[PDB]
Amino acid sequence: AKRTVKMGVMGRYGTRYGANPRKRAKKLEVSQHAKHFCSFCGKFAFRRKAVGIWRCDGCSKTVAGGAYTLSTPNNSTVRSTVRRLRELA
Amino acid sequence: GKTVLSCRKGNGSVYQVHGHKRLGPAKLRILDYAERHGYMRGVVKSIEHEAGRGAALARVEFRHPYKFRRVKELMVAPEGMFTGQSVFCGQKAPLAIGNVLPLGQITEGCIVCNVEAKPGDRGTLARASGDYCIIISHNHETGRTRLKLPSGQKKSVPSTSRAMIGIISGGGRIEKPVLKAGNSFYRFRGKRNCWPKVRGVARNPVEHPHGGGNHQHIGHPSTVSRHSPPGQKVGLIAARRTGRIRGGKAVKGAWHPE
RNA sequence: CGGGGAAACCCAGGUGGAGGCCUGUAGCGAUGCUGACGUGCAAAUCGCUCGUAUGAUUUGGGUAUCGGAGCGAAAGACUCA
RNA sequence: CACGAGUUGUUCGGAAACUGAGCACAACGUUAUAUCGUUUUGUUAGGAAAGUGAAGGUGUGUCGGCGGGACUGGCCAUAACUGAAAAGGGGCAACAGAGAACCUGGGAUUAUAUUCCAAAAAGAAAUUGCAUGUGGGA
RNA sequence: CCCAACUGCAGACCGUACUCAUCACCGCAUCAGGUCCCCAAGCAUAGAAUGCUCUGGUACAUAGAGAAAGGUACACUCAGGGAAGUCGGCAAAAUAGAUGCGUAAGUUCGCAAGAAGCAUUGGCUCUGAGGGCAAACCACAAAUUGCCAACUCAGAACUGCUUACGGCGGGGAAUCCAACUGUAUAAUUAAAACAUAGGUUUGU
RNA sequence: CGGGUAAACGGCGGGAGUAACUAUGACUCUCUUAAGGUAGCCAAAUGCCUCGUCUUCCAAUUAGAGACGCGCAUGAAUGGAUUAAUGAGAUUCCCUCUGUCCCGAGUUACUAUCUAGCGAAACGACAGUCAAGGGAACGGACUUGAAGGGCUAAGCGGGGA
RNA sequence: GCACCGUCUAGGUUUGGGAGUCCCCUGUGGGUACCCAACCGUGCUGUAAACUGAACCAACGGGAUUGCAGUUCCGGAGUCUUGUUUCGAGACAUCUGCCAGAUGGGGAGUUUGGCUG
RNA sequence: CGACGUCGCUUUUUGAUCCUUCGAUGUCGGCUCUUCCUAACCUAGCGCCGCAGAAGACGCUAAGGGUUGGAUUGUUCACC
RNA sequence: AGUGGUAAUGCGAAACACUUGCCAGGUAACAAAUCAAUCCUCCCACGGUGAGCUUUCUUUUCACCAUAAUCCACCUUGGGCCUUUUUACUUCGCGUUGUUCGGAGCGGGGGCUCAAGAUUGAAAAAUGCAGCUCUGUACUGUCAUUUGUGAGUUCUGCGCAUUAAAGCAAAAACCUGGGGUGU
RNA sequence: CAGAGGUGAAAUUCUUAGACCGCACCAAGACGAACUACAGCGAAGGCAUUCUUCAAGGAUACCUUCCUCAAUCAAGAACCAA
RNA sequence: GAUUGAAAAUCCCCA
RNA sequence: CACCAUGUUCAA
Numbered sequence A: 001a002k003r004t005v006k007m008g009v010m011g012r013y014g015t016r017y018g019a020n021p022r023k024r025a026k027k028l029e030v031s032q033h034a035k036h037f038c039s040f041c042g043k044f045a046f047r048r049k050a051v052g053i054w055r056c057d058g059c060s061k062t063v064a065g066g067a068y069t070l071s072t073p074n075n076s077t078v079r080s081t082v083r084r085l086r087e088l089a
Numbered sequence B: 001g002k003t004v005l006s007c008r009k010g011n012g013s014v015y016q017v018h019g020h021k022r023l024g025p026a027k028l029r030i031l032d033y034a035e036r037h038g039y040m041r042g043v044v045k046s047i048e049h050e051a052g053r054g055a056a057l058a059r060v061e062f063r064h065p066y067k068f069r070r071v072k073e074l075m076v077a078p079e080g081m082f083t084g085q086s087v088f089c090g091q092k093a094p095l096a097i098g099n100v101l102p103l104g105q106i107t108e109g110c111i112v113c114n115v116e117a118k119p120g121d122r123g124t125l126a127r128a129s130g131d132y133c134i135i136i137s138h139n140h141e142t143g144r145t146r147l148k149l150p151s152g153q154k155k156s157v158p159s160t161s162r163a164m165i166g167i168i169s170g171g172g173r174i175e176k177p178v179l180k181a182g183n184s185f186y187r188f189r190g191k192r193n194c195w196p197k198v199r200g201v202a203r204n205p206v207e208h209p210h211g212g213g214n215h216q217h218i219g220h221p222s223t224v225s226r227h228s229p230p231g232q233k234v235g236l237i238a239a240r241r242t243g244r245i246r247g248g249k250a251v252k253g254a255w256h257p258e
Numbered sequence C: 001c002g003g004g005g006a007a008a009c010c011c012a013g014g015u016g017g018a019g020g021c022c023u024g025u026a027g028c029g030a031u032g033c034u035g036a037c038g039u040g041c042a043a044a045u046c047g048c049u050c051g052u053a054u055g056a057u058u059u060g061g062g063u064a065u066c067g068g069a070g071c072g073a074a075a076g077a078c079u080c081a
Numbered sequence D: 001c002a003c004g005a006g007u008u009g010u011u012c013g014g015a016a017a018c019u020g021a022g023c024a025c026a027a028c029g030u031u032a033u034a035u036c037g038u039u040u041u042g043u044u045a046g047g048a049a050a051g052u053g054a055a056g057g058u059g060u061g062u063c064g065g066c067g068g069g070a071c072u073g074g075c076c077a078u079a080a081c082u083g084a085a086a087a088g089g090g091g092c093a094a095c096a097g098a099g100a101a102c103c104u105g106g107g108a109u110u111a112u113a114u115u116c117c118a119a120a121a122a123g124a125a126a127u128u129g130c131a132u133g134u135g136g137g138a
Numbered sequence E: 001c002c003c004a005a006c007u008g009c010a011g012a013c014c015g016u017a018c019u020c021a022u023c024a025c026c027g028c029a030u031c032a033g034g035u036c037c038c039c040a041a042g043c044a045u046a047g048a049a050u051g052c053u054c055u056g057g058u059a060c061a062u063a064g065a066g067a068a069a070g071g072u073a074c075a076c077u078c079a080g081g082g083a084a085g086u087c088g089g090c091a092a093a094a095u096a097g098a099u100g101c102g103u104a105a106g107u108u109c110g111c112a113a114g115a116a117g118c119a120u121u122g123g124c125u126c127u128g129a130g131g132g133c134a135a136a137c138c139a140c141a142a143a144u145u146g147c148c149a150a151c152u153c154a155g156a157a158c159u160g161c162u163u164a165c166g167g168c169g170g171g172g173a174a175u176c177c178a179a180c181u182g183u184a185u186a187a188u189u190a191a192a193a194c195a196u197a198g199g200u201u202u203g204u
Numbered sequence F: 001c002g003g004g005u006a007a008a009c010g011g012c013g014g015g016a017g018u019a020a021c022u023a024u025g026a027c028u029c030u031c032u033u034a035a036g037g038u039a040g041c042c043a044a045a046u047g048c049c050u051c052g053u054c055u056u057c058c059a060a061u062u063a064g065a066g067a068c069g070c071g072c073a074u075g076a077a078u079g080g081a082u083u084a085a086u087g088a089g090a091u092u093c094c095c096u097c098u099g100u101c102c103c104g105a106g107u108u109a110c111u112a113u114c115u116a117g118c119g120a121a122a123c124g125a126c127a128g129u130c131a132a133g134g135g136a137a138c139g140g141a142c143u144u145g146a147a148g149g150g151c152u153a154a155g156c157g158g159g160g161a
Numbered sequence G: 001g002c003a004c005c006g007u008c009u010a011g012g013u014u015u016g017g018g019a020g021u022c023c024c025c026u027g028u029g030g031g032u033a034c035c036c037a038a039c040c041g042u043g044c045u046g047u048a049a050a051c052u053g054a055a056c057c058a059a060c061g062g063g064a065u066u067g068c069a070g071u072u073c074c075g076g077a078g079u080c081u082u083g084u085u086u087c088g089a090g091a092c093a094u095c096u097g098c099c100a101g102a103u104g105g106g107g108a109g110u111u112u113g114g115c116u117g
Numbered sequence H: 001c002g003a004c005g006u007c008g009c010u011u012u013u014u015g016a017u018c019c020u021u022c023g024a025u026g027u028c029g030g031c032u033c034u035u036c037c038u039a040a041c042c043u044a045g046c047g048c049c050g051c052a053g054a055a056g057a058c059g060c061u062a063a064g065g066g067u068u069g070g071a072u073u074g075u076u077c078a079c080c
Numbered sequence I: 001a002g003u004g005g006u007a008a009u010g011c012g013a014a015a016c017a018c019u020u021g022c023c024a025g026g027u028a029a030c031a032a033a034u035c036a037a038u039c040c041u042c043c044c045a046c047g048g049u050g051a052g053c054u055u056u057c058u059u060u061u062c063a064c065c066a067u068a069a070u071c072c073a074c075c076u077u078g079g080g081c082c083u084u085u086u087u088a089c090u091u092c093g094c095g096u097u098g099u100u101c102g103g104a105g106c107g108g109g110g111g112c113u114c115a116a117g118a119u120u121g122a123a124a125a126a127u128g129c130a131g132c133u134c135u136g137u138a139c140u141g142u143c144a145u146u147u148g149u150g151a152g153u154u155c156u157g158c159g160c161a162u163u164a165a166a167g168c169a170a171a172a173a174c175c176u177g178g179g180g181u182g183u
Numbered sequence J: 001c002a003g004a005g006g007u008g009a010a011a012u013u014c015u016u017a018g019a020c021c022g023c024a025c026c027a028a029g030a031c032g033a034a035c036u037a038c039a040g041c042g043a044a045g046g047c048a049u050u051c052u053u054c055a056a057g058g059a060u061a062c063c064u065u066c067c068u069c070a071a072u073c074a075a076g077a078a079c080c081a082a
Numbered sequence K: 001g002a003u004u005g006a007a008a009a010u011c012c013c014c015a
Numbered sequence L: 001c002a003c004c005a006u007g008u009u010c011a012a
């Protein structure tokens, strides 16, 4: 059964550090501990192994990206821009 | 009086970099003949974390251009670098994330990192996690390239200076609240001895201009002159303005009309 | 693993063992008795009691920074009573 | 207190012989004066700090093969003429990090012992360095 | 010249006693202070709590005599009242383990909480439950048959208390201050002071 | 000289009149600042007057709490207000509890006490009974009186300024 | 004025010239399809989306002392140097000394009357 | 009882002074404990009254004896 | 001038030999918690020797019952891998106490290998301990001569391995290969 | 080169340190005029430059399929200008 | 009483 | 497009 109503993973902190700082940290903490899709090997097996470092448990690939998520939205924009400029040349 | 803490740190002593467990300086490969004329293709062998740095580092293995051996350079990995990726470095390298090209070969509007301020300096700009430079324009008459630095300032550099395509990995690090003094303790363990911080008003007047008084207060304006001697230059150094900024953040730093 | 629900989702039992989390040894400290002692066991100690005790934790050796200087989570604290 | 005694190692600890936080000889620079500074972010010094040597040519010895103990193509060691290749001087700093070939038994002491024990070594091993002979190859 | 299994000879230097502490070190000393590491038994018990104990160690720390007043104590008790004492509940008393039930305001929903409160606990003789092991393509009650270890929990009948080792929270209603964990005047001040995460500003 | 800047240092008014009982002053006049304290908060760890005034708490409260605000001298990162959890922090009350007290008593170990052995220090002008008087205005010495046989043990804290 | 120093090229495009498909059985193995000139280009054998191979101590060809091995050189691997290691800046300061001024409790030294119910 | 005046006493208030003490005389209050003073609150007697009685005012001799428990305040003091 | 196996990979008496010319990897070299846990410790049954107690009980109480390195030969558990079957996941299966895993190859059959043990001997009874016999010897003959689905125990399984804006030294020395030498 | 701005009229404001005005540019953020309609699309809120794209949606057409699968709705769900 | 249709209003201690 | 605020209570 559900053990917390809203705290979730932040319940390890008890009553400390404030609700809003806990909520803001929680979103990034869930992301950094979650499994992310690997474009190689097509599995949901990317886990962080240091800030900015992600290794896939499936294909053992290591990728540098994102402090708390596998890929940042800025990187996605940059990827499309580089591809578009490469075609333009 | 006694020496202020900010002056004492200049002596080095116990305030120097905690360099043990660091992998070494991160740089582009040497701008040799192969880079200036053709290209050098390497392979990313590992993505590694260094204490005191948010950005991930990439170990890239190259063949030695003149000898039968390998080189194994160490660079700041852009976001998206992966083990086994082929890295192209040189004049003829294609425009792709992770490749190193001369700035004059890169199209305007592209996003770059590990930018050489001087040709051959092996990367000095846009290195911290999540940072990048934007190529504004090229000027072939003078052979210069205009860039937008992460701080917002615009800087012109020679077009032979190299840059890496992409943004520095590990972005968004400062978005998570620390929540604990202990986490800051671990954060600064790998950097240097600069934490925790004692306010100047909490010290005694013998060791700080803001010290003393029967109330905790600075009894003089905290904006100090640019020409103030060390020990007196504390507070807001040469502040053009103070107070809460409203209606737009201006670009900081020195003013360069060029 | 069950129970609801058209859906979104919700409810219940277990497993699991998180925390500058709590009780409490060693350890590291030092609240009160304004207790003992106060030509003392002792130029700061003793007793009961007390803080904390997985962490910004405690500790050995080595090494680095001093004399208008060193060092200081800041008491003008500490730098061989 | 007086007198006389006791501490036994190829393997235990250190050193020979590793790097670490670091130290600072040389070198260079500075200072009226070195009793000052730089000296590991791969690393001294405007900086010629390698005396080490791959393939070869020349003699000795150890060999395999052919032809008629020796004679020539071929192997390996031994001394000498060159000359590939090696960028970044010499050291210190750990008796709790790295490294390290030995174990029990004992009637063997008044005191030392994985340190002493002698031919039934109480004994059983491990590990170095040079040698001989045997055997297998050159 | 290179190897294998032997074999022959030779394996240098320094340290090595003793101590490591309520007597061998420091504190003027054989000073109730301070001082790093390893090995760590039995019973009770949650146990490196605390009490007692085999092995090892020890009776060494001036003693003898011995109910004066007054003292100190890691010693107690006190009828009736119950903070009237006192600046002040200082000191002391009190609470006490485990198990079941039950638990308010407030709240950042995590807590507050062991909130508060109520009940049970011994001994003895039984009962039930929680297992292991071994065995003769369909389906086959090995859905039973033997043997056996180490413990825990629950439920009964009978029979007790003088409420009886040690060890072990008193609780509640509010105000002020600091968010919190921490740090800190070695030798009169531990706090509301410092730090902290968070917020803002400056230089580049 | 001319601009900018307060999450730089900091600062953030006075007098007079006025509503069909009275009072009060939404309102008006006037002097003046760089701006004249806004949101809040309070006899607050900040209020001189002050033990302010009301309510509550008690048989009784210069204390506590809740209100009021003419605030000597509250007030917004010199941060204002609020705040669950936390605290060897400061404060008030209640239940429980008690030798804190009414009001003292009894018991124990170790002392003190006596002995054997051992054996100091502080201190030490000289000394050491009082009353009054004068006196450097508070005598153990002096004046005049009153006491005073000598030597010892355990206590004690009036004096020996 | 003329001549000398003063020399070559990957690749791209178009102008002239000469001159040598075969074995084994549809399939397999081996091999031939060139040279020079002109213009552009400038030192140029590899990549134009990226997921981890290997590359050294010369093969070979010429000139002298059929094929083969020796001793030499020369190519393979262009040549040259009014010289700068390369790049950036550049006769200013990002430089060196001196003179001069402003600022300057960051710091030093010193002072901070007297009479007085 | 006592205006306008006037004459004194006391050292349980403050002040004035600076004689003693700065090679130091421990500085508030309370607790505890003893003693002294009388300008007498109670207690023993006695006058006087706008003293009927009762309850009281004033005065005399007399300090032998007695003179409390609490709330608030560190308080002396104050108040209940 | 190595060699066998479809493969995982095997084979050592000295041509499977030399490699500091050179190159590339590996060892040295680091890491939580949970759960299993080694050597050893403790406690139970089991049987011997001696000792304690025995008015009365106690088939009892206590002590002891030990096997060092170095070697030889070669059932259990856990991991990695190979081959085979893959019609293995259509309103699935394997597995942990535990947060998993699989056409990028799960499960089943048969194998290869690694890490911990177990066992077999050599060492090694000739040692050690206790008891006991006989004859003045620190004499001398001789007898004793293991079970636990119990409780602890960090050796180990154990890492690309912990909270992490913390991601956890280096080198000597050594090992293997790629090339080449042998040719 | 001497004013500009603004208004009912003015002033706050800018300006010989060159404002306003003129030309061609550069930067940045919004917006998509005229065409724009008693016109279109969308469940409502809403939606207007071009090009390239990704899923939809209504209407029409049919001698396709199918066979009552529907209407409206407490609870519940999603969207919703400023 | 003035005015009004009737009223309002208006006028006649130490430490 | 400067600036136009107010009208006591019932009842004709």
Ligand SMILES: NC[C@@H]1O[C@H](O[C@H]2[C@@H](O)[C@H](O[C@@H]3[C@@H](O)[C@H](N)C[C@H](N)[C@H]3O[C@H]3O[C@H](CO)[C@@H](O)[C@H](O)[C@H]3N)O[C@@H]2CO)[C@H](N)[C@@H](O)[C@@H]1O
Pocket (backbone or CB within 6 Å): F037, F038, F069
């Ligand atoms: N919104 C801000 C404006 O300023 C006003 O401010 C008002 C008050 O805040 C202020 O008055 C002062 C004030 O200066 C000062 N800081 C505090 C003082 N207590 C106030 O006093 C006022 O407030 C109290 C409380 O009601 C009253 O009892 C008192 O009578 C009144 N004078 O001045 C104004 C008095 O009328 C109002 N806050 C508000 O009506 C107005 O809109």
Ligand SMILES: NC[C@@H]1O[C@H](O[C@H]2[C@@H](O)[C@H](O[C@@H]3[C@@H](O)[C@H](N)C[C@H](N)[C@H]3O[C@H]3O[C@H](CO)[C@@H](O)[C@H](O)[C@H]3N)O[C@@H]2CO)[C@H](N)[C@@H](O)[C@@H]1O
Pocket (backbone or CB within 6 Å): G093, G095
């Ligand atoms: N050369 C002497 C050294 O200068 C150093 O300090 C010097 C520097 O900090 C500083 O140099 C600054 C420089 O920072 C800044 N980036 C540029 C500036 N031009 C320099 O200035 C200096 O150099 C120029 C040379 O053109 C001189 O004209 C000038 O006087 C001098 N102050 O000026 C100081 C005086 O030269 C050392 N701190 C000092 O101890 C030592 O004396």
Ligand SMILES: [K+]
Pocket (backbone or CB within 6 Å): none
């Ligand atoms: K500190």
Ligand SMILES: [K+]
Pocket (backbone or CB within 6 Å): E076, E077, F107
């Ligand atoms: K007693």
Ligand SMILES: [K+]
Pocket (backbone or CB within 6 Å): E109
């Ligand atoms: K809530």
Ligand SMILES: [K+]
Pocket (backbone or CB within 6 Å): E183, E184, E194
């Ligand atoms: K502090």
Ligand SMILES: [K+]
Pocket (backbone or CB within 6 Å): none
């Ligand atoms: K104020």
Ligand SMILES: [K+]
Pocket (backbone or CB within 6 Å): F086
């Ligand atoms: K706490």
Ligand SMILES: [K+]
Pocket (backbone or CB within 6 Å): none
């Ligand atoms: K006399």
Ligand SMILES: [K+]
Pocket (backbone or CB within 6 Å): none
């Ligand atoms: K000067």
Ligand SMILES: [K+]
Pocket (backbone or CB within 6 Å): G104, G105
């Ligand atoms: K100054």
Ligand SMILES: [Mg+2]
Pocket (backbone or CB within 6 Å): B016, B017, B019
């Ligand atoms: Mg440093």
Ligand SMILES: [Mg+2]
Pocket (backbone or CB within 6 Å): B197, B198, B199
């Ligand atoms: Mg601070």
Ligand SMILES: [Mg+2]
Pocket (backbone or CB within 6 Å): B202, B203, B204
């Ligand atoms: Mg201070």
Ligand SMILES: [Mg+2]
Pocket (backbone or CB within 6 Å): B001, B205, B206, B208, B209
């Ligand atoms: Mg100062």
Ligand SMILES: [Mg+2]
Pocket (backbone or CB within 6 Å): B201, B209, B210, B211, B212, B213, B216, B217, B218, B219
């Ligand atoms: Mg100050």
